[PDB]
């Protein structure tokens, strides 16, 4: 179609499959293996990207151009890498990925949404879709085209450090929340074939259903461990939301570090090729987790030659190396040259990668849109996060006896009130893991409103608000307070650091609640990624709210405390009486919860 130097794959009017096949046919082995290689920005340079024909870059947790970087700085970084990739012989644009898992959370000033467990409490898939939409905008504000979300793990044991990344222990709730996908990517057309990838265009991002499969089913909630369950159970609990993801055109699937009945997912041909590709008809690309192929072996990295063979033969398409790319490319090249990995396998991997790139418009818009920068931290998105935080809250108790006046909602006008606890004025703590840093952090790490700040913004001007992080009993009794709001809970964590066999909150937390509630009527706000031992907190408190990890918009909490809205959240997980009961999930034989899945008290708006 019509100039003399015409190249079909560069023609935006041509069908995606025609463009894919036209480009594939022109590629060298080096160019093909390059496409299959994803590297950290930390090891990327223009020469590296060009010389190795690199297909993808990522920012892992906390991998940022600098602390406090603006949206424009991110765009300029991504564009710099893209300019190198576009300078190769074939000019294949790279795709840049990041964990935008509760907003564009590595980025300073990005709206931080509640983590997934709290989103499960909302039972509101349309809310989650709108969060996906807002997240896509804030990711594109930074020039990034690809989000490693949603985590559709079904966490079956809250001792797991990623339980907060799971919408629920109930697969039906996880299935419902796959609405994140068309939020991130755009809605698929009416004709759409389940398993095809889809992204609407330059204001949307490629999504990633992760981590395939059974990441939430590991023994004792040990992160990356073995999931011991028969096929029927894997298919009934851990797999269903992957089919919903196929139906919604999820562009990519990331493989789990975990094993199923002793077989590493990163080496499981039956599940990756036999099931995901051949049965579910997935036609996007399958990506490893970071050093996932290394961890096939024990010790990890002890036979990288085998790691490459096993993973690529299993059906993985793109390898999140993410650092030692030279070794990866060299070994894979050697395996192909020696006939150990057939060219058909390479061509399939590259077909899938290119399919996603062409489909999403990446060849047409390889560079960032500077007009999108202002989407970052946009007030409308914060208003959405505030709605989500409020809807996520689960009221567990509202009065010590059935005959007491209900404490909540609290009055906005009172002479003097107390706000207390380690989590009352700590933005990092209310965001939890995957916020600015990989593991999260403490204090004022980004733009947001803490619980204290939200209280001050809510109350009548005549209301005096006193803050004390850890007041003693005498301070509270002598203070002339009308009531107190006390916020305590878990510190930020991610992945194995969050694995926890005792699930008791750090001190001081309970001691502060006891001191405050002993002196004045108190509403306890519990910040956690999961159910934790809660009977002692309940015994002390007039009212208690499970607020999960509500994100940057602390006014979501006070919107419910002061009755602007009624409490509506319902537990998306079983609340255990004791960790000795675990695992214990709804539908089990000996089900003996402190609070069952679905429990939640309500209030009416005042
Ligand atoms: C300890 O090394 C750090 O690990 C984290 C998490 S591993 C892996 O990372 C993927 C890409 O960021 C996530 O999509 C996936 O869910 C995680 O399991 C990694 O983010 C850091 O880059 C790395 O320093
Ligand atoms: C399949 C798997 O990951 N199994 C691991 C095992 O290798 C390790 O010794 C144990 C204790 O850390 O945790 C589990
Ligand atoms: C009272 C108690 O057991 N606390 C421990 C804590 O020291 C540890 O950091 C955490 C991580 O697993 O587990 C819990
Ligand atoms: C404390 C309170 O107002 N509770 C009410 C409940 O009695 C009523 O049935 C419902 C619908 O009006 O709203 C809520």
Author numbering: -3 to 602
Task: Give me lines lifted from the publication on this model.
In the barley β-d-glucan glucohydrolase, a glycoside hydrolase family 3 (GH3) enzyme, the Trp286/Trp434 clamp ensures β-d-glucosides binding, which is fundamental for substrate hydrolysis during plant growth and development. HvExoI folds into a two-domain structure consisting of an (α/β)8 barrel (domain 1) and an (α/β)6 sandwich (domain 2) with a 13 Å-deep active site pocket embracing the subsites −1 and +1, positioned at the interface between the two domains. HvExoI catalyses the hydrolytic removal of nonreducing glucose (Glc) moiety from a broad spectrum of poly- and oligomeric β-d-glucosides. The crucial role of substrate binding in HvExoI implies a pair of the aromatic Trp286 and Trp434 residues that form a clamp at the +1 subsite, which is positioned next to a pocket-shaped site at the −1 subsite, housing the Asp285 and Glu491 catalysts.
G6SG-OMe bound tightly to native and WT recombinant HvExoI with the respective Ki values of 0.1 ×10−3 M and 0.2 ×10−3 M, hinting that this thio-analogue should be observed in the active sites of WT and mutants. This is what we indeed observed in WT, and the W286A, W286Y, W286F, W434A, W434F, W434H, and W434Y mutants, where well-defined electron density maps of G6SG-OMe and tight H-bond networks that were formed through eight to ten residues (Asp95, Lys206, His207, Arg158, Tyr253, Asp285, Arg291, Glu491, Trp286, and Trp434). We noted that the quality of the G6SG-OMe electron density map slightly declined in W286Y but that these maps were well-formed in W286A and W286F, suggesting that in the W286Y mutant the process of ligand-binding in (or near) the active site may have been perturbed. While the Glc moieties of G6SG at the −1 subsite were oriented nearly identically in WT and mutant structures, the position of the Glc moiety at the +1 subsite varied – it was identical in WT and W286A, while in W434A it was rotated by 120° through the x-axis. Our findings suggest that although the mutations of Trp286 to Ala and His led to folded but inactive enzymes, enzyme activity retention is more sensitive to alterations of Trp286 than Trp434, likely due to the proximity of Trp286 to Asp285, the catalytic nucleophile.
